[PDB]
Symmetry: D2
Subunit: 295 residues, 4 copies
């Protein structure tokens, strides 16, 4: 039998960093959860009990804290690239590093209509993530994403004209609620190395901001023919705004809100144009995905 | 053996309601999760298999939807009072109704710097809750609360001068991170019945807004001597601003962020005044509670 | 304003202890999650920023580990009583200790049809818990419980003869699925102090075993007229088997499994006597409670 | 811009099925959660708002229930293959179906030392899963797995001889606790179609049983040199026992239990050979993976 693939490392490493401006006294915090998995010439640790090739996962954890202490942790695309590059340069037998970072929100509080210097609030569970794969001799591949962005529109969503056969009971509709949790990922063109990633630093935050803005505006303004149609419009726009992106992927659940027929009770009217009270459904849910690239 | 206490009903009933202003075309959504438990002369369903005294939990579910269709669902203090009163008036053998409502956030989206008519975003998992106990002949007792409000301040929190004995290892500090998830509850004076609850309707939203504002401002501005001291200041203020509140209760976890000593690595300085990178601790956590009333 | 009630302490303290029999070489592990909250003359920490009265929550954490090192951790009723008694005896101004312990399952593995000396498996998420309140001058009050015991029976459950009115749509049934997650609590007679708790040590594990056995056998064998009726039969039996219990409380969700009408598809028969495929409902759920004591 | 990849369908479809033996009166239940995603000539639903190519996700849900009603649901490898084949044969423009099934445990209860005919218990949260990809013209690819199997051994695990450099603080050890949640996947040789899957039906349950048995025995009996070494031994054995498996993949977290130094308290000895009380760590955790195939 043989080892076809192997990777190992440390997951769920929580890190917080504070930056203090001695001038203004203003403080800014960053909190993330980091995972680093390594690959290389490590097969013998599995096959011959040879631990000599293993950089202990505890040491990988130490390295994450040390790297955060000596480098900026934002944007996460840069921090991930520095961290991944460290491992492949430091250890001759390690040839790839896979770094996943989830950034948690700590938004500056406004007290009395004005930004507080050192107090923050977690406004929603939405995350900004990055996946960075640093492979010796093959550069740096970065996928950036936003996830956990939950939205709902109460009208201006339709779903009619779908295939109807002997398995179909769903009625066509011209006015429904649409609600989803957005997961959007944009994949960057391959970078030759850290120097190239550093040269594009300003584009990272800007592109995340654009992806978020296009998602929200399109969802709110599109008179949606389907989740499929609306998501394609979002991806099209993002690709048009940033040339250094190769593909955009969206994965959207369709979280159903059902009408409740109350006519059995005193002829109460609560369906169609009279629908006011709905039952949110926890499961099942539609799941719609698409990856859009350049023609 | 005998039945000392008994209650039964329906939990986890998800409800959504939309209000449409035909004039402006503006739509407003409300989403909540409701639990209703009843008490009364129902012992025989337990002791003699007598189902005749049971209002089926499925019927309680129907009743929640019907009541939401025919009444306003906001503020939740009023909706809960209407729902609880319904059961005790409708069924002669039911003498108490206990209604718990959790309101989920659906905040109107701003697109292009302006409120969208029918699109919403879930901004944080913070909840506004109510517990309403409607007891025949004893009026209506309402406890209102906010929970899941997660905040952090990066400085201006101290903890020194605590008891030191042979079980103590904790070092005193004059500058630490303070982070918590706020759970605050204000208990209203007993109301004689629905008419009295209706007479105070405007105070409900106003008091929730005040509780939230006082919590956030006090947390941000207090140079905290301890969680105990800071929380007492919050409760004091709320009681001073609303006479119809009898008590205010706070329950605050102390979510620890530990310094990381990196001196073993090239003499790197990351403790005390040089602390920049911290390790958030998932567990254990301090838990501090207090109930403040009027003297 | 005044402090009406106050308690503080450490939550989510995970503890593991191993016992090694040098004779047989057999090892036994115990893993629990502990919470300790104290009450006493501590108001001034809230009102005057006086930390001198505070036993730091970090010290409470240290104390839990030290106590587990020097005492048996089983049965949890005894360990909780020792831990709570420690605080009220040690600190003159602390007058009550509230200890909650959740015991996690680590069941010895059987390899080749025989008990392994030092390997264990977590067989289900069911917990054994205790709540111990040690109050100066008022003895020790112990509530023991089992929770997270999930069961289902596919027939021999009925529900008919309930109240029918204009809010009712539910059909009567003589054959349905019954599924629930059992939460059962038995409250012991008050104990005068540690000496008395030690004198009854053998009854703790025995009573937990009896409660579990009676719950499982009654659920399996009762031709259930309702959740209410079946749960009362369980509580009756437990009270009859252990005199030192004052009350037994059960809290049971009714986790619904709905029939699916497939007749619209080629006249397929899947309801009533022909029901084979069902849809488990995640929410809402019935919730039925009862506390049974001695007449 | 162009559609590079697209898939859509229904997730989180809960299904329960009961089988009743009219002879013995014995009943057997199966409960699963199913996800089906389709691919094919559906780009125009995204690009031109053409819903005519969409088999509604609600219809996919109906199809899952109908298929479960007319076919056996066990082993899940067969049920998944039937369900996936249905879509590609039924709809000319659908060319691939991806079916994921999670099977939940409902284990027959033993009452009075004997199997009950219709009562079951959920013994642990461990799952048996399958992923089936049915691709037109390319056969059926099946990956089977077990996950959520949580185990711990209190001794007979070592970790020494790993790389030591300026990032290393971890001490070598010859006796530690090892605990993990096992996720094991075995990938079958490609099958030409349903007929071939049906011909191997008996191997599915047998191979799952073997994978589970080999995992448990190896974990318990190996004097582990590392997680890497122990997991490789498991995969080797499974491959040797079933020729129709091409690869075996394991993904194992290393859930740390730390020693607690209590020497600061009255010289208490709780480290090394005297270690009895440990602190389970919720995060971070090592994560070790490997895919083993045939040489
Ligand atoms: C309600 N609904 C389905 O049943 N399928 C689908 C789909 O593919 N896309 C939708 O936008 N909605 C929807
Ligand atoms: C850090 N810390 C403890 O250990 N105990 C306590 C307490 O009671 N209150 C605090 O504000 N912090 C704190
Ligand atoms: C199905 N069902 C209800 O609707 N109510 C009730 C109840 O009170 N008790 C039951 O056992 N079942 C049930
Ligand atoms: C404790 N520990 C580490 O720090 N790394 C590793 C590793 O790769 N493998 C282990 O078995 N343990 C371990």
């Amino acid at each position: 039998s043989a080892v076809k693939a192997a990777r190992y490392g440390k997951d769920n490493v929580r890190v917080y960093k504070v930056h203090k401006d001695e001038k203004t006294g203003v403080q800014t915090v960053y909190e993330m959860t980091v995972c680093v998995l390594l690959e290389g010439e490590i097969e013998t640790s599995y096959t011959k009990a040879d631990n000599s090739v293993i950089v202990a996962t505890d040491s990988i954890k130490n390295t994450i804290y040390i790297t955060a202490k000596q480098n900026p942790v934002t944007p996460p695309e840069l921090f991930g690239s520095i961290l991944g590059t460290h491992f492949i340069e430091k250890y001759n037998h390690i040839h790839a590093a896979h770094v996943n970072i989830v950034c948690h929100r700590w938004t500056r509080m406004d007290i009395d209509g004005k930004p507080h210097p050192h107090s923050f609030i977690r406004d929603s569970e939405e995350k900004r993530n990055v996946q960075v794969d640093v492979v010796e001799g093959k550069g740096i591949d970065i996928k950036s994403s936003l996830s956990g962005l939950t939205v709902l529109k109460s009208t201006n969503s339709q779903f009619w004209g779908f295939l109807r056969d002997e398995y179909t009971t769903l009625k066509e509709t011209w006015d429904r609620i649409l609600s989803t949790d957005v997961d959007a990922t944009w994949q960057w063109k391959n970078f030759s190395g850290l120097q190239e990633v550093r040269s594009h630093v300003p584009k990272f935050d800007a592109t995340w901001a654009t992806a978020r803005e296009v998602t929200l505006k399109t969802f709110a303004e599109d008179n949606s023919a389907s989740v499929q149609a609306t998501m394609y419009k979002m991806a099209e726009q993002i690709l048009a705004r940033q040339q250094l992106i190769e593909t955009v992927e969206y994965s959207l659940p369709n979280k159903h809100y059902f009408e409740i027929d109350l006519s059995w009770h005193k002829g109460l009217q609560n369906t169609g144009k009279n629908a006011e009270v709905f039952a949110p459904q926890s499961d099942p849910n539609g799941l719609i995905k698409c990856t859009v690239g350049r023609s």
